[PDB]
Amino acid sequence: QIQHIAIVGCVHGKYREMYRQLSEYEKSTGKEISFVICTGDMQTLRYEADLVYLKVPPKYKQMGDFHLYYEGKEKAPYLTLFIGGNHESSNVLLHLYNGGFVCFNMYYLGVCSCININGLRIVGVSGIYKSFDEKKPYTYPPSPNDVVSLFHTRNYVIQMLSNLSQSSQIDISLSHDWPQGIVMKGNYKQLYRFQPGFKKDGASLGSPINKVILNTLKPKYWISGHMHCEYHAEEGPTHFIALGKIGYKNAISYLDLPLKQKTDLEYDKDWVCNLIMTWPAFSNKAQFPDLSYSISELLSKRTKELDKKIIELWEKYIGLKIIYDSDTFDIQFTSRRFYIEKIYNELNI
Ligand SMILES: [Mn+2]
C-alpha cells in the first residue's frame, strides 16, 4: 500500500494555480494525493494591511490568492503543510510561531517543529539564513520595522530540533534555503550549466543552520525551495530534493511512500516535550527566546516519566490531533502559550 505526497517549492501567492496543477496530476494519473508539502514563500496575506510585512521588491508588492482562501471564497482541496521562506506575511507567521492553520486545510509548521501524519515524522525549519540575525530574538507584537528580519532563521532551532531523531527516525525535513554544501553532492556541473549564478558561492551556497540539522537528524528526505530549480543530491542516507517556483514545470514533484497507517495530522510527542521543557526560555511574550537560558540545558532535563506526564497533559488541554481553529492569530498566539505555560507549571520543577 502506497501514499502519494505532493512536494511543492515556492508558491509565491499562486494558490489557485498550484491546486489546479495538483488536480491535473490526479486527473492524468488517476493517483490520489494524500497531502501536500510546500517549502515556503507562501505569502499568506489576509488583507491589504498585511502588505507591510511582505519583504519583496516593489514590483512584487501584490496580494496574491491567499486572501481568497482566508475569506473562504476558495477552499484548499488537500491538506497542505508548509514552512515560511523569505517572502511571507511575516506578522502572521510570528503570531503562529508555534504553528497553526492559516485557513482551512493549510497548516503552518511554525518557526520549526515536527508533526506526525500517516505514520511519518516531518520536521520543518522556516526562513533563510543571514549571519547578522541568527542570534536575534523575536520581538512581539510584530512591528513594521521588523519586515526585514522576521524571516531570517535563528540559530536556536538547532538545539530545539537536535534530539528529535533519538526515539525514531525523521522521514521528511523541510527547509526554504538549501542545507549548506549539499550543492556539491549532486550533478553540480550540470546545475551550473542551467544556473551559472550558483557557481560563485561554491560549497558555501545555502544555510549552515540547515546543514547542521541535516547532519544531526539524517532524515530520509530533505526538501528545499528558494533556488528556482530542480536538483537532487545524496548526503549519505539523506535524499535531497530541491524544487522550483510555481508557474514552472520543476515546482511540483511527488513522493511515493509506503503507507502502513492512514492517520490524521498529529503533534509529534517528542516535539511537544521539547516545547514544554523549553518554556522558561520563551516565558517573556515580548521578547523570545531569552538565550541567557541554555536551550539544550533545559532539554537535558527530559525524562521518560516527565515525557509521559507532558503528553498526558497536552492531550488533555490541546489534544494530540492538530485541528482547525478559526480564532484570529493573535488569540492563537496567546492561547497556545497559555497551555504550554500551564503544562510546564504542572510538572513542578
Ligand atoms: Mn525564496
Numbering used by the authors: 5 to 353
What did the publication describing this PDB structure actually write?
The spliceosome excises introns from nascent messenger RNA (1) in the form of a lariat containing an unusual 2′,5′-phosphodiester linkage (2). Hydrolysis of this linkage is rate-limiting in lariat degradation after splicing, and is required for efficient maturation of many small nucleolar RNAs (snoRNA) and micro RNAs (mirtrons) that are derived from intronic RNA. Dbr1 is tuned to hydrolyze 2′,5′-phosphodiester RNA linkages in branched RNA and not the considerably more abundant canonical 3′,5′-phosphodiester linkages, although the molecular basis for this selectivity has remained elusive for several decades despite extensive biochemical characterization of the enzyme. Sequence analyses predict Dbr1 consists of an N-terminal domain belonging to the metallophosphoesterase (MPE) superfamily of enzymes and a C-terminal domain (CTD) lacking detectible sequence similarity to any other class of protein.
